[PDB]
Amino acid sequence: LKLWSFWRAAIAEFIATLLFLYITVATVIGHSKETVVCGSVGLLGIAWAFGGMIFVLVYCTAGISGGHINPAVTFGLFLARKVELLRALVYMIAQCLGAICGVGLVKAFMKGPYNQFGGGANSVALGYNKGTALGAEIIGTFVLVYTVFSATDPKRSARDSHVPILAPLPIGFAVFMVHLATIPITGTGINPARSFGAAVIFNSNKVWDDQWIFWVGPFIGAAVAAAYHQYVLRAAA
Amino acid sequence: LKLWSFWRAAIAEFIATLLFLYITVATVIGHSKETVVCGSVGLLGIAWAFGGMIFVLVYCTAGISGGHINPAVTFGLFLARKVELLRALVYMIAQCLGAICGVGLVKAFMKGPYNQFGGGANSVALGYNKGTALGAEIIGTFVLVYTVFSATDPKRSARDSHVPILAPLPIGFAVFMVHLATIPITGTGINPARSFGAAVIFNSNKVWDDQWIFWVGPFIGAAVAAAYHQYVLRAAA
Amino acid sequence: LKLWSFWRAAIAEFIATLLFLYITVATVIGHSKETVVCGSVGLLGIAWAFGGMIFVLVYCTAGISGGHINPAVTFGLFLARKVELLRALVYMIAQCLGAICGVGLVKAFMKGPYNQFGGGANSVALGYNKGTALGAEIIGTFVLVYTVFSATDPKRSARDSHVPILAPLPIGFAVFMVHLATIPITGTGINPARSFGAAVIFNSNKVWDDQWIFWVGPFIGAAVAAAYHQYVLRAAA
Amino acid sequence: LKLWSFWRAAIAEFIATLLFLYITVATVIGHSKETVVCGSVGLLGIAWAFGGMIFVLVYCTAGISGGHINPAVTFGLFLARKVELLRALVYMIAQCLGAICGVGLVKAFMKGPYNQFGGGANSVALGYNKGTALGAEIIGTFVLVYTVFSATDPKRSARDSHVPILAPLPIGFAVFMVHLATIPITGTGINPARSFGAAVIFNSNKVWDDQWIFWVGPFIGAAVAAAYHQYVLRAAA
């Protein structure tokens, strides 16, 4: 009755996260497998795929679920009391499961290229240390969640809830920007479900060893954005 | 009287699909004929041409025809009872004829490059099987039509009809995103008229042999998006 | 009194066209002079410079002059009786003078590269004939002006006039798209002032010999768009 | 009470300028350190990073501070009496301090690449003289500030102030466009805080010797835009 709206929101987050990972990791593998020098969409094209799909998917789901597609976004909004505990945890599970599925589909379609070129997985690139990767993930997620907070509609909520509706364009652009800066360092995580889905499917020791960075970094970044918006700027009111 | 509005909608879809194919296939041939390494718009530029022209053309025609430019979009909206049978079939014919014309014009302007570089045609790239191409076309069209449904105006319709007006930016971006992911696999069809126009003008056995994928994939993708939006999300109401 | 508004509109078109040519031709020369393979913004970056500056400049001037920046846009709107004769001719002179000035400034800043790399001038590339270039200019300008007509505000006009206000984003995107398709053929003109400014400053026989294409093509494209919108679609009413 | 709103605006400008410099200079260093030919986001990606972050950050801060992120924007608005003297000077200090911090963070994360590849600093490229660089900075800042003035909301102001709210998309696009044209010449400054932050952290004689260009150019460009908008166009009223 409003429980149906709740379950439909969970489904919307599951499916959107699946589509997010399918499109973006297919883009990464498609770029990576390219033999002809500069016959691919390039790193710029990869950054567009991540930012542009967030714009599209937040647009589609904002009125249905709130359009999170990302455990760190759900967590930041939870801390600011904009999402209730049970919804938050249900969203994070839906997101993580959807992400596994989307990456699974890319692997099903292009198994050889998928394994050869890194599986869309986040890890620390050679030359950087884990403190740098962690710092880059915290600041990158801070940019994203600070944008999400600035993009919340104070009056309007997702169907049968108090989860605010979000303006999708600035949020997609924040994701695009952070990818431009962070791809050389970690591939860019800023989204624990996206990092976890790829780790589950790719299944390498190196990737699993770095995985904590892509949970801890984004949760800290999200928490600091929440405190900044709500307490330092008092930008809610 | 409203029959004139009907015929003007058909003309609007014919012309828009012609412009769609002219601009995008001229972009593909112009990229492909380039000798100087990295002197072209690249695959990223091709993906922009397809997404950006959908944004422009849906913007221009949304109030006149509904702005479909694509038999799979018309079919999905038909299944949800948003387009009547006779309009649907008239739109699909207008789209397919316009597409033949637009590709015809590119061939008229650059015949040598046109034949040498593949004629803007969709087919399965070497290394992928038809099951993968079909899967990639279904999911890609699902992203597009799921976006179209989320972009419908519940209150406002095209002139003298009940075909909903569509928000063109998210739709153009969905087309752009799906191109980033799918170009290496099939060139990206997700539009039976676009695939058919190029097949008619280019006229090769290889291309004709793959053509069913670019009709069946998109129609299935569109049907599943329709059912998802209307029955699982109940996102109409 | 409204004559001052008239003269301020002419100044706004002069300055906007100057800025248009300075930014875009500086972009073209900056790309072209690049020695390091793929150390430039590429042809995609050039296409963005033209589309993006039209978006910016139409945004700035739409309420002041109508935001034309382009004799073919002024001519199409003139034919549809949306601009009076004396205003139309004053706008075209302002646009052509501004364009000469903007290209003049690029030459002043980078004289060596400016002359070596073609001076931002439009002409027919080797391999295409003049019939093809003319056809490409007609269709390209048709896309642009068809978009301008679809972007007109039926209720709202520029200050102290009946020149409609225009939605700048779709128009900028139409310019971007047409550049993706047409750069390899003519560089893309679709704007007689832009083509003329560069011809005046660069001053070569080859360029002057092709210059009629960049006036005749766009004026025909604009006229057909006007007739299409107003008479075939009846999209005014 | 409104003094708190004042201090929160200063903090918002400090943090936004820090994020601006971190994301954009990390993008520049990440591009520059790339060994594999065309394995980076390219100069186009760098131009996106600067324009896109201005769009994002102006979006986030427009209702809190006015969204300046740039001493030349604050100065132009000051000259037009849209910002009071004490606020103006407090904003410029906040911006310059934030910029030092953001560049500082990039250096902390990638010290080797940071020093090797120029430190995100603006200076005159080999082949251009200082008159050209100064001219390019004046016109580039004129485009930006002319856009800012055209983007001001006549009715609505930042919290507890008379600083107008700004439309962030056209402003971000103006920054993007000016980067396309100006990167080969100076790297593009058009923002005294951005130029100063990088000079402070990179600390080279060459860079310090050119630094006056990146203060004088933008302040003149801003002043001429202010006079153009307010006195020649009378575009306020």
Side-chain angles (χ1 to χ4, degrees), chain B residues 8 11-12 15 19 22-23 26-27 33 38-41 44-45 48-49 52-53 55-56 59-61 64 109-110 159, chain C residues 38 43-44 48 128 132 135-136 139 142-143 146-147 150-151 167 170 173-174 177 180-181 228 232-235 237:
Chain B
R8 290 167 173 147
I11 289 173
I15 295 298
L19 295 173
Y22 168 78
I23 294 290
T27 303
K33 75 185 254 286
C38 330
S40 74
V41 297
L44 180 48
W48 269 122
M53 280 302 290
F55 164 55
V56 170
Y59 178 89
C60 289
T61 64
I64 306 292
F109 288 4
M110 59 199 83
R159 178 172 67 181
Chain C
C38 330
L43 266 47
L44 180 48
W48 269 122
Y128 305 88
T132 288
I139 295 171
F142 177 91
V143 172
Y146 174 38
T147 303
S150 314
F173 255 83
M177 293 306 95
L180 299 170
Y228 178 66
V232 5
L233 295 191
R234 245 85 212 331

Short mmCIF file of all heavy atoms in Angstrom, two decimals, chain B residues 8 11-12 15 19 22-23 26-27 33 38-41 44-45 48-49 52-53 55-56 59-61 64 109-110 159, chain C residues 38 43-44 48 128 132 135-136 139 142-143 146-147 150-151 167 170 173-174 177 180-181 228 232-235 237:
data_model
loop_
_atom_site.label_atom_id
_atom_site.label_comp_id
_atom_site.label_asym_id
_atom_site.label_seq_id
_atom_site.Cartn_x
_atom_site.Cartn_y
_atom_site.Cartn_z
N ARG B 8 0.81 15.71 -40.96
CA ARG B 8 1.96 16.54 -40.57
C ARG B 8 2.90 15.86 -39.55
O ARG B 8 4.10 16.02 -39.64
CB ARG B 8 1.50 17.89 -40.06
CG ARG B 8 0.94 18.74 -41.21
CD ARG B 8 0.18 19.94 -40.69
NE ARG B 8 -0.20 20.81 -41.81
CZ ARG B 8 -1.32 21.54 -41.83
NH1 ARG B 8 -2.18 21.48 -40.82
NH2 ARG B 8 -1.58 22.31 -42.88
N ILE B 11 4.93 13.39 -41.60
CA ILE B 11 5.94 14.12 -42.35
C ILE B 11 7.10 14.51 -41.39
O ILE B 11 8.27 14.37 -41.75
CB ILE B 11 5.33 15.39 -42.98
CG1 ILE B 11 4.39 15.00 -44.13
CG2 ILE B 11 6.42 16.34 -43.51
CD1 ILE B 11 3.60 16.20 -44.69
N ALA B 12 6.75 14.97 -40.19
CA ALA B 12 7.74 15.39 -39.19
C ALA B 12 8.68 14.22 -38.83
O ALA B 12 9.91 14.41 -38.71
CB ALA B 12 7.05 15.94 -37.95
N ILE B 15 11.01 13.44 -42.09
CA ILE B 15 12.08 14.41 -42.18
C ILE B 15 13.10 14.30 -41.03
O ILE B 15 14.31 14.35 -41.28
CB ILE B 15 11.55 15.87 -42.30
CG1 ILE B 15 10.77 16.07 -43.63
CG2 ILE B 15 12.72 16.91 -42.14
CD1 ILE B 15 11.60 15.86 -44.94
N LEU B 19 17.08 13.48 -41.41
CA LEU B 19 18.17 14.32 -40.86
C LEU B 19 19.04 13.54 -39.91
O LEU B 19 20.24 13.73 -39.90
CB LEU B 19 17.60 15.54 -40.13
CG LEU B 19 16.85 16.53 -41.04
CD1 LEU B 19 16.18 17.61 -40.19
CD2 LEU B 19 17.80 17.15 -42.11
N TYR B 22 21.34 11.33 -42.02
CA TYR B 22 22.32 12.09 -42.82
C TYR B 22 23.47 12.55 -41.90
O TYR B 22 24.65 12.26 -42.17
CB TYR B 22 21.68 13.30 -43.53
CG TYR B 22 22.75 14.22 -44.08
CD1 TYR B 22 23.42 13.90 -45.26
CD2 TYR B 22 23.13 15.37 -43.37
CE1 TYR B 22 24.45 14.73 -45.73
CE2 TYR B 22 24.15 16.21 -43.85
CZ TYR B 22 24.80 15.88 -45.02
OH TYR B 22 25.80 16.71 -45.49
N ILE B 23 23.11 13.19 -40.78
CA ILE B 23 24.16 13.77 -39.93
C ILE B 23 25.06 12.67 -39.32
O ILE B 23 26.27 12.77 -39.30
CB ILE B 23 23.55 14.69 -38.82
CG1 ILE B 23 22.88 15.94 -39.46
CG2 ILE B 23 24.60 15.04 -37.75
CD1 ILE B 23 23.85 16.98 -40.10
N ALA B 26 27.16 10.61 -42.16
CA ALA B 26 28.20 11.52 -42.63
C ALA B 26 29.33 11.66 -41.60
O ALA B 26 30.52 11.71 -41.98
CB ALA B 26 27.63 12.92 -43.00
N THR B 27 28.97 11.75 -40.31
CA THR B 27 29.95 11.73 -39.22
C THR B 27 30.79 10.43 -39.22
O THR B 27 32.03 10.48 -39.13
CB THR B 27 29.29 12.02 -37.79
OG1 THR B 27 28.61 13.28 -37.85
CG2 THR B 27 30.36 12.12 -36.71
N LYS B 33 37.21 7.70 -43.05
CA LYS B 33 38.05 7.99 -44.21
C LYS B 33 39.33 8.71 -43.83
O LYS B 33 40.21 8.90 -44.68
CB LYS B 33 37.27 8.80 -45.27
CG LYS B 33 37.05 10.25 -44.93
CD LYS B 33 36.17 10.96 -45.97
CE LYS B 33 36.99 11.90 -46.86
NZ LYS B 33 37.39 13.16 -46.14
N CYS B 38 44.47 10.15 -35.70
CA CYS B 38 43.86 11.06 -34.72
C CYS B 38 43.59 12.47 -35.26
O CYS B 38 43.61 13.45 -34.51
CB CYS B 38 44.70 11.12 -33.45
SG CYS B 38 45.56 9.56 -33.17
N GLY B 39 43.33 12.55 -36.56
CA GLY B 39 42.84 13.79 -37.16
C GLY B 39 41.32 13.83 -37.31
O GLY B 39 40.80 14.70 -38.02
N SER B 40 40.60 12.90 -36.66
CA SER B 40 39.13 12.81 -36.80
C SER B 40 38.41 13.12 -35.47
O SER B 40 39.06 13.36 -34.46
CB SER B 40 38.73 11.43 -37.32
OG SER B 40 38.85 10.45 -36.30
N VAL B 41 37.07 13.08 -35.48
CA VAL B 41 36.27 13.33 -34.25
C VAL B 41 36.31 12.12 -33.33
O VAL B 41 35.89 12.20 -32.17
CB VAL B 41 34.80 13.76 -34.57
CG1 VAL B 41 34.80 15.07 -35.33
CG2 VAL B 41 34.04 12.67 -35.36
N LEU B 44 34.28 8.79 -29.93
CA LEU B 44 33.55 9.64 -29.00
C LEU B 44 32.69 10.63 -29.80
O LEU B 44 31.54 10.86 -29.45
CB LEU B 44 34.52 10.41 -28.10
CG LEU B 44 33.89 11.34 -27.05
CD1 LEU B 44 32.77 10.65 -26.26
CD2 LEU B 44 35.01 11.79 -26.11
N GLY B 45 33.26 11.22 -30.84
CA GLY B 45 32.52 12.13 -31.71
C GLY B 45 31.36 11.46 -32.42
O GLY B 45 30.27 12.04 -32.55
N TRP B 48 28.60 11.08 -29.81
CA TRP B 48 27.94 12.40 -29.68
C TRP B 48 26.98 12.70 -30.82
O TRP B 48 25.91 13.29 -30.61
CB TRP B 48 28.97 13.55 -29.57
CG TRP B 48 29.39 13.89 -28.13
CD1 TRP B 48 30.65 13.87 -27.61
CD2 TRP B 48 28.51 14.34 -27.06
NE1 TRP B 48 30.63 14.27 -26.27
CE2 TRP B 48 29.33 14.55 -25.91
CE3 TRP B 48 27.12 14.55 -26.96
CZ2 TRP B 48 28.80 14.97 -24.66
CZ3 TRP B 48 26.58 15.00 -25.69
CH2 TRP B 48 27.43 15.21 -24.59
N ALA B 49 27.36 12.32 -32.04
CA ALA B 49 26.52 12.63 -33.19
C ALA B 49 25.16 11.93 -33.06
O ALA B 49 24.10 12.53 -33.32
CB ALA B 49 27.25 12.25 -34.53
N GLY B 52 23.39 13.44 -29.58
CA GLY B 52 23.08 14.86 -29.78
C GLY B 52 22.00 15.09 -30.83
O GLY B 52 21.17 15.97 -30.64
N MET B 53 22.00 14.32 -31.93
CA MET B 53 20.93 14.52 -32.93
C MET B 53 19.58 14.05 -32.39
O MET B 53 18.56 14.64 -32.69
CB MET B 53 21.21 13.78 -34.25
CG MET B 53 22.22 14.54 -35.19
SD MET B 53 21.67 16.23 -35.63
CE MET B 53 20.29 15.84 -36.74
N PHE B 55 18.66 14.29 -29.21
CA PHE B 55 18.26 15.44 -28.36
C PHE B 55 17.64 16.57 -29.23
O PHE B 55 16.55 17.04 -28.95
CB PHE B 55 19.47 15.98 -27.58
CG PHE B 55 19.25 17.37 -26.99
CD1 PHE B 55 18.15 17.65 -26.16
CD2 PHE B 55 20.15 18.40 -27.28
CE1 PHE B 55 17.93 18.96 -25.61
CE2 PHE B 55 19.95 19.74 -26.73
CZ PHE B 55 18.85 20.00 -25.92
N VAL B 56 18.35 16.98 -30.29
CA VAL B 56 17.90 18.06 -31.17
C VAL B 56 16.56 17.70 -31.84
O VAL B 56 15.63 18.51 -31.85
CB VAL B 56 18.97 18.41 -32.26
CG1 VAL B 56 18.38 19.38 -33.32
CG2 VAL B 56 20.21 19.09 -31.61
N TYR B 59 13.58 17.39 -29.48
CA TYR B 59 13.23 18.76 -29.11
C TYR B 59 12.34 19.40 -30.17
O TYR B 59 11.31 20.01 -29.83
CB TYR B 59 14.50 19.63 -28.85
CG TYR B 59 14.13 21.06 -28.52
CD1 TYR B 59 13.90 21.45 -27.19
CD2 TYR B 59 13.99 22.02 -29.52
CE1 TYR B 59 13.53 22.79 -26.87
CE2 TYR B 59 13.61 23.35 -29.20
CZ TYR B 59 13.39 23.71 -27.88
OH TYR B 59 13.04 25.02 -27.59
N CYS B 60 12.74 19.29 -31.44
CA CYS B 60 12.00 19.91 -32.56
C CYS B 60 10.61 19.30 -32.80
O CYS B 60 9.66 20.04 -33.13
CB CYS B 60 12.80 19.80 -33.86
SG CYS B 60 14.28 20.86 -33.90
N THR B 61 10.51 17.98 -32.69
CA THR B 61 9.29 17.27 -33.08
C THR B 61 8.37 16.81 -31.95
O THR B 61 7.24 16.33 -32.24
CB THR B 61 9.59 16.06 -33.96
OG1 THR B 61 10.33 15.11 -33.20
CG2 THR B 61 10.39 16.46 -35.21
N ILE B 64 4.85 18.08 -32.17
CA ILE B 64 4.26 17.88 -33.49
C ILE B 64 3.89 16.41 -33.71
O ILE B 64 2.75 16.11 -34.14
CB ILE B 64 5.20 18.35 -34.62
CG1 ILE B 64 5.63 19.80 -34.41
CG2 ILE B 64 4.55 18.15 -36.03
CD1 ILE B 64 4.53 20.84 -34.56
N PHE B 109 26.77 12.17 -51.65
CA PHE B 109 27.84 13.14 -51.38
C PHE B 109 29.28 12.61 -51.31
O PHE B 109 30.23 13.36 -51.54
CB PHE B 109 27.58 13.86 -50.04
CG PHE B 109 26.44 14.83 -50.05
CD1 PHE B 109 25.65 14.99 -51.17
CD2 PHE B 109 26.17 15.59 -48.91
CE1 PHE B 109 24.58 15.91 -51.18
CE2 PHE B 109 25.11 16.49 -48.89
CZ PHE B 109 24.30 16.64 -50.03
N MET B 110 29.44 11.35 -50.90
CA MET B 110 30.76 10.80 -50.69
C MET B 110 30.80 9.29 -51.06
O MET B 110 31.14 8.44 -50.25
CB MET B 110 31.25 11.08 -49.25
CG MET B 110 30.38 10.54 -48.12
SD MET B 110 30.70 11.35 -46.53
CE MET B 110 29.66 12.82 -46.75
N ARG B 159 0.33 17.74 -30.71
CA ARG B 159 -0.80 18.40 -31.37
C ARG B 159 -1.91 17.45 -31.85
O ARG B 159 -1.67 16.59 -32.70
CB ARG B 159 -0.28 19.20 -32.56
CG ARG B 159 -1.34 19.89 -33.37
CD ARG B 159 -0.66 20.79 -34.38
NE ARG B 159 0.08 20.06 -35.41
CZ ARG B 159 0.76 20.67 -36.37
NH1 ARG B 159 0.76 22.00 -36.41
NH2 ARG B 159 1.42 19.98 -37.28
N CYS C 38 48.34 14.16 -31.16
CA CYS C 38 47.26 14.04 -30.17
C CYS C 38 47.51 14.82 -28.88
O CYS C 38 47.05 14.44 -27.80
CB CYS C 38 46.97 12.57 -29.86
SG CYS C 38 47.31 11.54 -31.30
N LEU C 43 39.54 17.48 -33.54
CA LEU C 43 38.37 17.95 -34.28
C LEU C 43 37.08 17.98 -33.44
O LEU C 43 36.18 18.76 -33.73
CB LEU C 43 38.10 17.08 -35.50
CG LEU C 43 38.73 17.60 -36.81
CD1 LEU C 43 40.18 18.01 -36.66
CD2 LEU C 43 38.58 16.51 -37.85
N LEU C 44 37.00 17.09 -32.46
CA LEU C 44 35.86 17.08 -31.54
C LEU C 44 35.86 18.39 -30.74
O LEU C 44 34.81 18.99 -30.54
CB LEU C 44 35.95 15.88 -30.58
CG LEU C 44 34.81 15.74 -29.56
CD1 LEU C 44 33.43 15.87 -30.22
CD2 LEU C 44 34.97 14.37 -28.90
N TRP C 48 32.99 21.34 -30.60
CA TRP C 48 32.49 21.91 -29.32
C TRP C 48 32.63 23.42 -29.26
O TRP C 48 31.75 24.12 -28.72
CB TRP C 48 33.20 21.28 -28.10
CG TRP C 48 32.50 20.04 -27.53
CD1 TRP C 48 33.03 18.79 -27.38
CD2 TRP C 48 31.15 19.98 -27.00
NE1 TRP C 48 32.09 17.93 -26.80
CE2 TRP C 48 30.93 18.63 -26.57
CE3 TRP C 48 30.10 20.92 -26.88
CZ2 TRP C 48 29.68 18.20 -26.02
CZ3 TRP C 48 28.84 20.48 -26.30
CH2 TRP C 48 28.68 19.14 -25.87
N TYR C 128 36.27 16.46 -52.67
CA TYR C 128 34.84 16.74 -52.82
C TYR C 128 34.60 17.76 -53.92
O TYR C 128 35.43 18.63 -54.15
CB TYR C 128 34.24 17.28 -51.51
CG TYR C 128 34.46 16.42 -50.29
CD1 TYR C 128 35.60 16.55 -49.51
CD2 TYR C 128 33.50 15.48 -49.89
CE1 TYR C 128 35.81 15.77 -48.38
CE2 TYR C 128 33.69 14.70 -48.76
CZ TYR C 128 34.85 14.85 -48.02
OH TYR C 128 35.05 14.10 -46.91
N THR C 132 28.60 18.86 -53.93
CA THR C 132 28.59 18.20 -52.63
C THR C 132 28.70 19.21 -51.46
O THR C 132 27.93 19.14 -50.49
CB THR C 132 29.72 17.15 -52.55
OG1 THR C 132 29.38 16.03 -53.37
CG2 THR C 132 29.93 16.66 -51.11
N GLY C 135 25.48 21.15 -51.34
CA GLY C 135 24.48 20.29 -50.71
C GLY C 135 24.68 20.18 -49.20
O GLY C 135 23.72 20.28 -48.46
N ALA C 136 25.93 19.97 -48.77
CA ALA C 136 26.25 19.84 -47.34
C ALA C 136 25.94 21.15 -46.58
O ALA C 136 25.43 21.10 -45.45
CB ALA C 136 27.71 19.44 -47.13
N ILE C 139 21.84 21.50 -46.35
CA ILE C 139 21.22 20.60 -45.37
C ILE C 139 21.66 21.00 -43.96
O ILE C 139 20.87 20.98 -43.03
CB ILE C 139 21.58 19.12 -45.61
CG1 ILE C 139 21.00 18.67 -46.96
CG2 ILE C 139 20.98 18.22 -44.45
CD1 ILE C 139 21.45 17.29 -47.43
N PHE C 142 19.83 23.98 -42.97
CA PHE C 142 18.43 23.58 -42.72
C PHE C 142 18.26 23.01 -41.30
O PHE C 142 17.37 23.40 -40.58
CB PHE C 142 17.97 22.54 -43.77
CG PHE C 142 16.56 22.04 -43.54
CD1 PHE C 142 15.48 22.66 -44.15
CD2 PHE C 142 16.31 20.93 -42.72
CE1 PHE C 142 14.16 22.19 -43.94
CE2 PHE C 142 15.01 20.47 -42.50
CZ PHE C 142 13.94 21.10 -43.11
N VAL C 143 19.14 22.08 -40.91
CA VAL C 143 19.11 21.59 -39.52
C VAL C 143 19.15 22.77 -38.52
O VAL C 143 18.34 22.84 -37.62
CB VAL C 143 20.28 20.61 -39.23
CG1 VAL C 143 20.36 20.25 -37.68
CG2 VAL C 143 20.10 19.30 -40.06
N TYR C 146 15.83 25.15 -38.87
CA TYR C 146 14.69 24.34 -38.42
C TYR C 146 14.68 24.28 -36.88
O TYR C 146 13.64 24.49 -36.21
CB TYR C 146 14.77 22.93 -39.02
CG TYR C 146 13.70 21.98 -38.50
CD1 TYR C 146 12.40 22.42 -38.24
CD2 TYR C 146 14.00 20.63 -38.27
CE1 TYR C 146 11.40 21.54 -37.73
CE2 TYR C 146 13.00 19.74 -37.79
CZ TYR C 146 11.72 20.20 -37.53
OH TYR C 146 10.75 19.34 -37.07
N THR C 147 15.86 24.07 -36.30
CA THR C 147 15.99 24.14 -34.82
C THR C 147 15.66 25.54 -34.25
O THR C 147 14.93 25.66 -33.25
CB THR C 147 17.44 23.68 -34.37
OG1 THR C 147 17.64 22.34 -34.84
CG2 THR C 147 17.51 23.66 -32.84
N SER C 150 11.97 25.96 -34.22
CA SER C 150 11.39 25.15 -33.15
C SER C 150 11.71 25.72 -31.75
O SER C 150 11.06 25.37 -30.77
CB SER C 150 11.87 23.68 -33.23
OG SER C 150 11.80 23.18 -34.55
N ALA C 151 12.74 26.55 -31.66
CA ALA C 151 13.20 27.11 -30.38
C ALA C 151 12.64 28.49 -30.08
O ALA C 151 13.00 29.07 -29.07
CB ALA C 151 14.77 27.15 -30.31
N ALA C 167 15.43 29.58 -27.44
CA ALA C 167 16.05 28.65 -26.48
C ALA C 167 17.47 28.28 -26.97
O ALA C 167 17.61 27.62 -27.99
CB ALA C 167 15.18 27.38 -26.28
N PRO C 170 19.34 23.91 -27.54
CA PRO C 170 19.10 23.08 -28.72
C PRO C 170 19.81 23.68 -29.93
O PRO C 170 20.32 22.93 -30.79
CB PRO C 170 17.56 23.17 -28.93
CG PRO C 170 17.04 23.58 -27.57
CD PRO C 170 18.09 24.43 -26.96
N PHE C 173 23.52 22.91 -29.77
CA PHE C 173 23.68 21.50 -30.09
C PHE C 173 23.52 21.22 -31.55
O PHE C 173 24.26 20.39 -32.06
CB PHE C 173 22.73 20.60 -29.26
CG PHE C 173 23.46 19.87 -28.17
CD1 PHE C 173 23.71 20.50 -26.96
CD2 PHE C 173 23.97 18.59 -28.41
CE1 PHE C 173 24.44 19.86 -25.95
CE2 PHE C 173 24.68 17.91 -27.42
CZ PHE C 173 24.91 18.54 -26.17
N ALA C 174 22.58 21.88 -32.23
CA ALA C 174 22.44 21.72 -33.69
C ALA C 174 23.75 22.16 -34.38
O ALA C 174 24.23 21.49 -35.31
CB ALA C 174 21.24 22.57 -34.25
N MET C 177 26.42 19.37 -33.73
CA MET C 177 26.12 18.21 -34.59
C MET C 177 26.52 18.42 -36.05
O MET C 177 27.10 17.54 -36.69
CB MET C 177 24.62 17.85 -34.56
CG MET C 177 24.08 17.31 -33.19
SD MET C 177 25.02 15.91 -32.56
CE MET C 177 26.20 16.69 -31.46
N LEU C 180 30.15 18.14 -36.51
CA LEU C 180 30.67 16.77 -36.53
C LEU C 180 30.63 16.16 -37.95
O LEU C 180 31.54 15.37 -38.32
CB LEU C 180 29.94 15.84 -35.53
CG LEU C 180 30.06 16.26 -34.04
CD1 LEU C 180 29.10 15.43 -33.16
CD2 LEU C 180 31.52 16.11 -33.55
N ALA C 181 29.58 16.49 -38.71
CA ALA C 181 29.30 15.86 -40.00
C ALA C 181 30.02 16.57 -41.13
O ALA C 181 30.38 15.91 -42.10
CB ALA C 181 27.80 15.86 -40.30
N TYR C 228 9.28 25.06 -44.57
CA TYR C 228 8.93 23.79 -43.91
C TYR C 228 8.19 24.02 -42.59
O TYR C 228 7.10 23.47 -42.37
CB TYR C 228 10.18 22.92 -43.70
CG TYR C 228 9.93 21.61 -42.98
CD1 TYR C 228 9.16 20.60 -43.57
CD2 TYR C 228 10.48 21.36 -41.73
CE1 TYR C 228 8.91 19.40 -42.92
CE2 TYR C 228 10.27 20.15 -41.07
CZ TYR C 228 9.47 19.18 -41.67
OH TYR C 228 9.24 17.99 -41.05
N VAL C 232 4.58 23.79 -44.25
CA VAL C 232 4.28 22.36 -44.23
C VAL C 232 3.85 21.83 -42.85
O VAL C 232 2.81 21.18 -42.74
CB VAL C 232 5.22 21.43 -45.10
CG1 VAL C 232 6.37 22.16 -45.73
CG2 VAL C 232 5.61 20.10 -44.39
N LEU C 233 4.61 22.16 -41.80
CA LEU C 233 4.24 21.74 -40.44
C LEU C 233 3.17 22.62 -39.80
O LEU C 233 2.49 22.18 -38.86
CB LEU C 233 5.48 21.67 -39.53
CG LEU C 233 6.54 20.61 -39.87
CD1 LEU C 233 7.55 20.47 -38.72
CD2 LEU C 233 5.92 19.24 -40.20
N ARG C 234 3.03 23.85 -40.30
CA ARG C 234 2.17 24.84 -39.64
C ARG C 234 2.48 24.87 -38.16
O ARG C 234 1.58 24.86 -37.32
CB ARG C 234 0.69 24.53 -39.88
CG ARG C 234 -0.04 25.58 -40.69
CD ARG C 234 0.10 25.38 -42.20
NE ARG C 234 0.10 26.63 -42.97
CZ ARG C 234 -0.51 27.77 -42.63
NH1 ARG C 234 -1.23 27.86 -41.51
NH2 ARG C 234 -0.41 28.83 -43.43
N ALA C 235 3.77 24.91 -37.84
CA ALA C 235 4.23 24.71 -36.47
C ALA C 235 4.22 26.00 -35.66
O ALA C 235 4.47 25.99 -34.45
CB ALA C 235 5.62 24.05 -36.46
N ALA C 237 1.29 27.69 -35.65
CA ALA C 237 -0.06 27.45 -35.13
C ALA C 237 -0.72 26.21 -35.75
O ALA C 237 -0.96 25.20 -35.06
CB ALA C 237 -0.95 28.69 -35.36
#
